[PDB]
Design an enzyme around this catalytic site. Sequence first.
Site, PDB file in Angstrom:
ATOM      1  N   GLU A  52       0.822  -1.213   0.000  1.00  0.00           N
ATOM      2  CA  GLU A  52       0.000   0.000   0.000  1.00  0.00           C
ATOM      3  C   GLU A  52       0.845   1.246   0.000  1.00  0.00           C
ATOM      4  O   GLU A  52       0.536   2.211  -0.710  1.00  0.00           O
ATOM      5  CB  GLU A  52      -0.928   0.006   1.211  1.00  0.00           C
ATOM      6  CG  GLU A  52      -2.073  -0.985   1.129  1.00  0.00           C
ATOM      7  CD  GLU A  52      -2.700  -1.270   2.467  1.00  0.00           C
ATOM      8  OE1 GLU A  52      -2.469  -0.508   3.420  1.00  0.00           O
ATOM      9  OE2 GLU A  52      -3.429  -2.291   2.555  1.00  0.00           O
ATOM     10  N   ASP A  90      -7.726   2.753   0.649  1.00  0.00           N
ATOM     11  CA  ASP A  90      -6.328   2.509   0.972  1.00  0.00           C
ATOM     12  C   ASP A  90      -5.499   3.790   0.889  1.00  0.00           C
ATOM     13  O   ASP A  90      -4.637   4.017   1.741  1.00  0.00           O
ATOM     14  CB  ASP A  90      -5.736   1.409   0.092  1.00  0.00           C
ATOM     15  CG  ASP A  90      -6.349   0.070   0.377  1.00  0.00           C
ATOM     16  OD1 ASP A  90      -6.014  -0.497   1.400  1.00  0.00           O
ATOM     17  OD2 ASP A  90      -7.119  -0.463  -0.484  1.00  0.00           O
ATOM     18  N   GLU A 103      -7.518   1.923  -4.260  1.00  0.00           N
ATOM     19  CA  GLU A 103      -7.663   0.612  -3.658  1.00  0.00           C
ATOM     20  C   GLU A 103      -6.510  -0.272  -4.182  1.00  0.00           C
ATOM     21  O   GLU A 103      -6.151  -0.205  -5.318  1.00  0.00           O
ATOM     22  CB  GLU A 103      -9.014   0.003  -4.061  1.00  0.00           C
ATOM     23  CG  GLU A 103     -10.201   0.595  -3.298  1.00  0.00           C
ATOM     24  CD  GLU A 103     -10.069   0.342  -1.824  1.00  0.00           C
ATOM     25  OE1 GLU A 103     -10.069  -0.859  -1.476  1.00  0.00           O
ATOM     26  OE2 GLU A 103      -9.900   1.297  -1.037  1.00  0.00           O
ATOM     27  N   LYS A 116     -11.814  -9.952  -6.454  1.00  0.00           N
ATOM     28  CA  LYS A 116     -11.444  -8.798  -5.647  1.00  0.00           C
ATOM     29  C   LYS A 116     -11.433  -7.508  -6.471  1.00  0.00           C
ATOM     30  O   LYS A 116     -11.851  -6.446  -5.981  1.00  0.00           O
ATOM     31  CB  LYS A 116     -10.105  -9.047  -4.995  1.00  0.00           C
ATOM     32  CG  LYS A 116      -9.640  -7.922  -4.082  1.00  0.00           C
ATOM     33  CD  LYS A 116     -10.672  -7.484  -3.031  1.00  0.00           C
ATOM     34  CE  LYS A 116     -10.131  -6.488  -2.025  1.00  0.00           C
ATOM     35  NZ  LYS A 116     -11.221  -5.797  -1.260  1.00  0.00           N
TER      36      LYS A 116
HETATM   37 MN   LIG Z   1      -8.851  -1.771  -0.011  1.00  0.00          MN
END
Ligand SMILES: [Mn+3]
Length: 171
Positions: A52, A90, A103, A116
Amino acid sequence: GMEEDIACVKDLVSKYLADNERLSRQKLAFLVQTEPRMLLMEGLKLLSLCIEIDSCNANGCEHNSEDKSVERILHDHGILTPSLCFVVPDGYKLTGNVLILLECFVRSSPANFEQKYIEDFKKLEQLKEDLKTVNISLIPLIDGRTSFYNEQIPDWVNDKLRDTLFSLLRY
Ligand SMILES: [Mn+3]
């Protein structure tokens, strides 16, 4: 045996994880664990955090480490709306009326990756109409990855970690 393999991985993470304050808390959350389910859970969380941070860097977004909802991100800029779905992105960037939401995820198999990707895509898309009521335009970014490799840990250490985590699935 397995215990020494776990100890080795802990030592490698200790020595070789990037020396970055943003990683410290999750580094400790992994290192203190003894139980296989917790080593897995916290080891995966550590890898996700690393990815991330890289994704936010690459996409010019702030990493959402305070877990702000989209409603809160807008509120921070003096924009009030009660009508948004709950989403905690995120990463994000709000510049004037342009909201970038990021994301991030890792999935290895095509079926799981696709599931996902669809989930994250739809989640962001469901914000679009409500954001228009407060004059916000949405740029929804999905950084779906198949790899855990990242800039916060050497790849060779990443491999040792994942191999040990894989072995822990036996428990
Ligand atoms: Mn996420």
